[PDB]
Amino acid sequence: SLALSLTADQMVSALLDAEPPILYSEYDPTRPFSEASMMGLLTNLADRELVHMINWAKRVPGFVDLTLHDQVHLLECAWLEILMIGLVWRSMEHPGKLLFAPNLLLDRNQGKCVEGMVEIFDMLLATSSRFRMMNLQGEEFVCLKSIILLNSGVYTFSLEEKDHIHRVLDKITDTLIHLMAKAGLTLQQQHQRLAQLLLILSHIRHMSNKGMEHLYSMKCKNVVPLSDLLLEMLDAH
Amino acid sequence: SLALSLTADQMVSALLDAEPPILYSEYDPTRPFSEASMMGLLTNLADRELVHMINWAKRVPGFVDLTLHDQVHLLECAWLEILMIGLVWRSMEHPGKLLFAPNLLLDRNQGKCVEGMVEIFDMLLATSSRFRMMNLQGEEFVCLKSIILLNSGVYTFKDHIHRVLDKITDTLIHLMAKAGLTLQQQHQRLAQLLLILSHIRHMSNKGMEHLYSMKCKNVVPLSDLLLEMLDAHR
Amino acid sequence: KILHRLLQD
Amino acid sequence: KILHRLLQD
Ligand SMILES: Oc1ccc(C(c2cccc(O)c2)=C2[C@H]3CCC[C@@H]2CCC3)cc1
Numbered sequence: 001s002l003a004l005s006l007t008a009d010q011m012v013s014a015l016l017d018a019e020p021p022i023l024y025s026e027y028d029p030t031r032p033f034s035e036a037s038m039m040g041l042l043t044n045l046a047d048r049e050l051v052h053m054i055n056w057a058k059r060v061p062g063f064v065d066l067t068l069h070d071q072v073h074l075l076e077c078a079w080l081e082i083l084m085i086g087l088v089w090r091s092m093e094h095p096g097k098l099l100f101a102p103n104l105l106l107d108r109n110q111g112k113c114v115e116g117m118v119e120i121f122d123m124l125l126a127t128s129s130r131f132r133m134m135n136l137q138g139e140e141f142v143c144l145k146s147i148i149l150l151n152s153g154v155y156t157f158s159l160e161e162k163d164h165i166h167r168v169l170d171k172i173t174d175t176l177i178h179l180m181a182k183a184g185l186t187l188q189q190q191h192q193r194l195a196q197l198l199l200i201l202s203h204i205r206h207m208s209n210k211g212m213e214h215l216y217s218m219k220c221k222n223v224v225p226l227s228d229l230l231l232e233m234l235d236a237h
Numbered sequence: 238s239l240a241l242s243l244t245a246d247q248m249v250s251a252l253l254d255a256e257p258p259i260l261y262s263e264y265d266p267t268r269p270f271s272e273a274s275m276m277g278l279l280t281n282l283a284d285r286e287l288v289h290m291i292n293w294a295k296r297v298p299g300f301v302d303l304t305l306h307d308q309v310h311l312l313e314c315a316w317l318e319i320l321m322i323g324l325v326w327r328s329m330e331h332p333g334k335l336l337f338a339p340n341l342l343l344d345r346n347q348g349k350c351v352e353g354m355v356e357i358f359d360m361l362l363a364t365s366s367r368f369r370m371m372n373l374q375g376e377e378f379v380c381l382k383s384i385i386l387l388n389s390g391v392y393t394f395k396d397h398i399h400r401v402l403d404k405i406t407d408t409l410i411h412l413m414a415k416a417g418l419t420l421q422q423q424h425q426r427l428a429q430l431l432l433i434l435s436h437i438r439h440m441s442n443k444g445m446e447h448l449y450s451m452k453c454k455n456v457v458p459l460s461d462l463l464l465e466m467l468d469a470h471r
Numbered sequence: 472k473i474l475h476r477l478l479q480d
Numbered sequence: 481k482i483l484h485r486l487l488q489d
């Protein structure tokens with residue numbers, strides 16, 4: 001492989017260059033609110049983000065080597081997690097707001113629209129506030145996001161492929177530690193922060209499962225229609 | 238508090254002594270099992286385990302310092318995770334099998350008697366096989382379980398809880414240093430252990446929906462305690 | 472709730 | 481299989 005032959009600094013650069021762009025929505029601040037329309041916007045946005053995520057996953061070291069079937073499974077399991085941690089990261093500098101798009105900020109109050117969505121908003125807001133108090137760095141973010149991609153579906157796999165995935169996961173771990181060592185953190189502070197970061201992934205999994213149930217609810221409901229791609233990602237769960 | 242004033246050796250001993258006992262299931266009805274039969278044994282077992290878990294939680298350093306409300310919220314969020322990681326740990330030296338009780342060892346094939354339960358079994362068996370290849374030690378296990386207790390509900394509210402979580406992190410690293418693992422091997426294994434917690438969370442939510450589905454069907458009557466713990470996830 | 476009673480005893 | 485397509489550029 002080529003992932004294990006990478007230094008920590010090179011690992012960061014590869015992930016940092018592979019970052020997807022921040023997409024805009026078709027939001028109109030003349031149009032007031034709703035709940036069919038908001039979900040319509042969020043569905044349109046998430047569907048376009050998925051296309052970039054899929055091509056982003058290709059540029060994640062190690063993901064290329066995996067079987068097509070393995071790649072499909074990993075994305076099917078973690079796609080909402082990756083969307084959320086991206087959303088949370090974009091919203092760090094906007095307390096009480098969830099920057100879905102530069103032209104779509106939204107509020108906890110606007111989460112009351114759509115039954116059950118307000119609870120998920122609070123959890124996303126709490127995650128963003130956590131990232132803010134930890135002063136999460138961009139280099140640490142791209143590490144965590146790539147960890148989610150490889151780890152979320154690794155426990156649902158003749159195959160020495162799971163061993164190669166854990167090897168890459170160990171490399172990303174070394175990369176995270178390398179970064180914290182640069183920031184002047186003590187050896188004790190490196191362990192604590194590493195733990196703090198990975199424990200957040202447990203809550204991101206929780207939000208994803210909650211969000212997955214919410215999306216399945218609006219699917220069996222007569223409105224709003226989901227994209228053909230989202231329905232495939234949703235049926236995977 | 239008193240948790241922060243503990244050495245990692247004292248922290249281990251405190252958690253190791255706090256361990257709940259391994260309870261037995263009812264010796265009747267005995268296999269083979271049906272849907273109503275198996276869930277009846279599991280509900281009864283889990284309900285009695287809950288009582289011991291609550292007492293175990295009080296013995297967890299730092300958990301006492303929290304308000305009663307916070308103690309309620311933490312247990313409500315993580316109770317199924319704690320049962321699961323307990324189940325997985327007991328089933329470690331029983332590959333392909335799940336040890337709910339010393340007199341209740343279940344196969345994958347037995348999980349099919351309940352609609353949608355066999356998928357949770359596989360995830361549990363995979364976690365057990367994962368613990369086995371890592372050779373998870375008991376001292377590491379009691380650390381992981383307390384972490385689940387304090388972490389799983391800390392974002393649905395707390396500087397104290399994070400300080401204790403750091404202390405357990407310091408404890409986990411200490412244990413690995415004793416085993417002769419290098420510094421690089423210490424961070425790596427720490428990451429591996431905590432990443433499994435993400436899958437445990439996933440299993441719990443999958444299991445939570447399963448129990449809620451059983452509740453709706455009205456067939457096998459959940460205990461009033463279980464109903465309260467279940468309603469907390471709604 | 473029952474959970475409180477078991478936490479106080 | 482839309483996901484399978486996009487993975488195959
Ligand atoms: O960057 C994004 C973009 C969109 C989301 C979506 C989403 C995802 C798919 C369809 C949809 O309508 C909404 C959601 C977020 C998080 C929970 C799932 C849903 C509904 C509430 C907000 C999350 C992150």
Ligand SMILES: Oc1ccc(C(c2cccc(O)c2)=C2[C@H]3CCC[C@@H]2CCC3)cc1
Nearest residue numbers: 276279280282283320321324354357444447
């Ligand atoms: O140690 C234990 C004991 C019981 C469980 C229970 C359980 C939990 C509550 C009520 C119930 O009937 C079953 C469950 C496990 C895990 C998922 C929920 C259910 C059903 C399948 C097995 C898990 C671990």
